[PDB]
Structures are given as C-alpha cells and as structure tokens.
Enzyme design. Structure first.
Site, short mmCIF file in Angstrom:
data_model
loop_
_atom_site.label_atom_id
_atom_site.label_comp_id
_atom_site.label_asym_id
_atom_site.label_seq_id
_atom_site.Cartn_x
_atom_site.Cartn_y
_atom_site.Cartn_z
N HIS A 273 -0.31 11.91 6.25
CA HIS A 273 -0.32 10.45 6.44
C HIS A 273 -1.28 9.79 5.46
CE1 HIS A 273 -1.23 6.61 8.78
NE2 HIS A 273 0.13 6.61 8.69
N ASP A 274 -2.46 10.38 5.32
CA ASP A 274 -3.47 9.92 4.38
C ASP A 274 -2.88 9.99 2.96
OD1 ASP A 274 -5.32 9.50 6.46
OD2 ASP A 274 -6.47 11.27 5.96
N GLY B 259 -7.85 9.00 10.94
CA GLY B 259 -8.62 7.77 10.72
C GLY B 259 -9.58 7.64 9.54
N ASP C 284 4.15 5.77 8.63
CA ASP C 284 3.65 5.72 10.00
C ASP C 284 4.68 6.41 10.90
OD1 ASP C 284 1.57 4.18 9.15
OD2 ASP C 284 2.08 2.37 10.22
N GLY D 239 -12.13 9.14 7.12
CA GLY D 239 -12.22 10.56 6.80
C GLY D 239 -11.26 11.00 5.72
N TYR E 45 -0.23 7.18 2.47
CA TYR E 45 -0.86 5.90 2.16
C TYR E 45 -1.36 5.91 0.71
CZ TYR E 45 -1.07 3.96 6.99
OH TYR E 45 -0.77 3.33 8.20
N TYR F 246 5.05 -4.52 9.59
CA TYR F 246 6.48 -4.23 9.29
C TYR F 246 7.24 -4.36 10.61
CZ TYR F 246 4.61 0.27 10.96
OH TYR F 246 3.87 1.14 11.72
N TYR G 254 -9.05 14.74 9.13
CA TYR G 254 -8.28 13.73 8.43
C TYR G 254 -7.84 12.49 9.18
CZ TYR G 254 -8.40 16.48 4.21
OH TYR G 254 -8.86 17.17 3.08
C1 LIG Z 1 -6.66 -1.65 16.58
N1 LIG Z 1 -7.30 -0.60 15.76
C2 LIG Z 1 -8.76 -0.59 16.07
C3 LIG Z 1 -6.55 0.62 16.09
C4 LIG Z 1 -6.90 1.93 15.39
C5 LIG Z 1 -8.09 2.50 14.83
N2 LIG Z 1 -7.79 3.78 14.33
C6 LIG Z 1 -6.45 4.10 14.57
C7 LIG Z 1 -5.54 5.25 14.28
C8 LIG Z 1 -6.02 6.51 13.55
C9 LIG Z 1 -5.01 7.67 13.55
C10 LIG Z 1 -4.39 7.94 12.17
O1 LIG Z 1 -5.33 8.15 11.04
C11 LIG Z 1 -4.22 5.12 14.67
C12 LIG Z 1 -3.73 3.97 15.29
C13 LIG Z 1 -4.51 2.86 15.60
C14 LIG Z 1 -5.84 2.94 15.23
#
Ligand SMILES: CN(C)Cc1c[nH]c2c(CCCO)cccc12
Length: 121
Positions: free
Chosen positions: A47-48, A29, A89, A31, A51, A64, A27
């Site tokens: 978290h997903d 990022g 977050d 996914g 959102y 924010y 989950y």
């Molecule tokens: C700048 N950018 C490329 C940053 C970024 C990509 N994936 C991230 C996740 C994924 C964790 C939560 O799903 C958390 C925090 C920052 C990032």
C-alpha cells in the site's frame, strides 16, 4: 481520503482502521522501513509502495467514489489520481481481509527501532 480508506477497511474486516491498523507493524500508517512483520504488514508495505507510485497525488485528502457490485468494491470514475488512489486502497482492504487469519495484536503500536531490513518496492 484517509477517512474513506478507514471506512473501506471497517466494511471489509469489521475492525476500526484506528487503532487496529493505524500503528501495526513496520509499515502500516506513519512508518515504512525494515522487514514487514507478517502478511498484514506486507499489505501495508505494498500500500505504501502503491501510494509511492503516485507522487503528485494526495491520498490522505483526495476523495474518490466507490460502489459495491457483488459485495465487491468497484472504483468509480473521477480524476486519474482519485481512480489510482481508490485501486490502492481497495487492494489494501482486500489484503487485510485475506489475512485476518494471521492478524496479531502483538504488532499493534510496534516499536520503530525493531524495523530493520531493506526492502524495495
Ligand atoms: C481519520 N484518520 C485519523 C484515520 C486514520 C489514521 N490512520 C489510518 C489508517 C492506517 C492504515 C494503513 O496505513 C487507515 C485508515 C484510516 C486511518
């Protein structure tokens, strides 16, 4: 915004959001399918979902403001979307903090086909 959430995660955990959490499990990022691998992954699932409760907000880009009141994250007043994104977050960062004791590097860059099991929010 994505960059702020990354900073919030580093402050809480001491781990860079990328690559420690950006590709973790089923989950975190990109996914979100199947049964969460462990407690850290369940954090990403919630978290997903968080959102998902905000279809007309944009958590990657919307910035924010937050402060620290006893080392505690405290979301400050902005738009309703910004306020709601911050609380999502904030919960995730704290969740990660809470479960560092079971964090496993084996779930980094987890394979998509291994994410099976329906789970509703
Ligand atoms: C700048 N950018 C490329 C940053 C970024 C990509 N994936 C991230 C996740 C994924 C964790 C939560 O799903 C958390 C925090 C920052 C990032």
């Amino acid at each position: 915004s994505l960059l702020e959430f990354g900073k919030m995660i580093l402050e809480e955990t001491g781990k860079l959001a990328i690559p420690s959490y950006s590709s973790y499990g089923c989950y975190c990022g990109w996914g979100g399918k199947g049964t969460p691998k462990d407690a850290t992954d369940r954090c990403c699932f919630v978290h997903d979902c968080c959102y998902g409760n905000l279809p007309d907000c944009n958590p990657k880009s919307d910035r924010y403001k937050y402060k620290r009141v006893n080392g505690a994250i405290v979301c400050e007043k902005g738009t309703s979307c910004e306020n709601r994104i911050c609380e999502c977050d904030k919960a995730a960062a704290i969740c990660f903090r809470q479960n560092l004791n079971t964090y496993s590097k084996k779930y980094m860059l987890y394979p998509d086909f291994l994410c099976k099991g329906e789970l509703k929010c």
